[PDB]
Amino acid sequence: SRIWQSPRFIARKRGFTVKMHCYMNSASGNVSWLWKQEMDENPQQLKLEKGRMEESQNESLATLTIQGIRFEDNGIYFCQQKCNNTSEVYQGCGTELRVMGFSTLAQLKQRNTLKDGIIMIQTLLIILFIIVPIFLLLD
């Protein structure tokens, strides 16, 4: 009711940028971010990597910015603000991020069945080099 975040569930390709928004009052202090991966049910304190992660705080608006993502970023995020006049913790509804990969259903099936065929063939080459040298060198 008081703290408001958006969007809710993002699905970006590996490589691009995302942005997240947090709207509440410019009255009692600043906002601190969190981080929480799938395993816990207790969050942590977020690191801000120099360059790769950024943050701004405009008039009635503040924003986490993240460039250059990869698979170790599957987080569920939180902007958090405890009151400075009543001392009450207020906390939003988070966001989620899940980072996709390049290929499609066409090339994935072809390379899977293809390279399965390749490893079948070269394992048959191990069959040739496990039958021929022992039988031949043992005469």
């Binding site: 970006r12 390709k13 940028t17 942005k19 709207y23 698979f71 996709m100 990969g101 290929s103 259903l105």
Partner: protein, 366 residues
Amino acid sequence: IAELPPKVSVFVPPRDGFFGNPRKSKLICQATGFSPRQIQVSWLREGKQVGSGVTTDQVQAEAKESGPTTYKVTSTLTIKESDWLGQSMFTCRVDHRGLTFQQNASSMCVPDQDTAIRVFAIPPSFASIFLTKSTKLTCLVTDLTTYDSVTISWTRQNGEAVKTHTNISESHPNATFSAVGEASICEDDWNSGERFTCTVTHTDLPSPLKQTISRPKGVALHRPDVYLLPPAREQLNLRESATITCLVTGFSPADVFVQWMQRGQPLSPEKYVTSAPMPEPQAPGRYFAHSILTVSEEEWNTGETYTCVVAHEALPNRVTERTVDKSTEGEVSADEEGFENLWATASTFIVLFLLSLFYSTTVTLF
């Protein structure tokens, strides 16, 4: 005894009730409600004082109960149809208490005069019902100056009148003055859909303006499609601006409703321009629409999604929402397809074949 001036007004005759051979007519310039007695009702025909037919009657004492004892007089100028249609200025010059009252005159039937302008009639849309439960109906009369003697009534199919109307329109720069005559109405009456009509009257025309409006029936209902097209790749190279196109296609009936959510709050209502339906070529009875939106190129390079909403009474839950940023594409499998394994096979077989040549060549030697 106060010097009360009268109301000088030539009660003009109609053009049909004429008697005599040649056909004659009276001019009654009845100015009453004046004290004291002194008045000079001098008939001027085109500025020239009339002597023929001037019947200046007795200045009778109005024995009024309040105020001073005022007076009344009823002058009479007998003219002809050769005088009434003679196109002369029959000025009822009243020199009441030394105050000359040149009553301007006319010598025909006077329509007003030759001009008729414009009027609109906006039906209430479907999306202006399920928002506010406030089923208005208006009719904008416009393109005039805000004067008095306007009246915007409303007649049903029965010809009876309905409710009045406030907030009549205001001062406008380019003589683009107007008015908004609204009246409330029930909903199932509008759904039954008979011809509601508004009429207007000014001191501009002798003509009513029978603007008719209703709801047509009989049309079918069809779900629409939505697609969303990312911008023109040539247009990025010009380094100025982008476009986006919403597109709805193949629905029934008209009256669709769109707007744009980005960042969480909707846009201003002037960054984006919609369109009106026009009939489909292929299907016999459907329509389409457009929606355009422009932002710069620093904006569209940096994430910053956009979303389209539609609104239509036949879509099965009234609202859908499609969204295209830049790359929301890229099918399943978050993690795998790897990075380590591929570069690994690259390096291992490029070293391994160079470590196969010197094995094969000595086999070609011995």
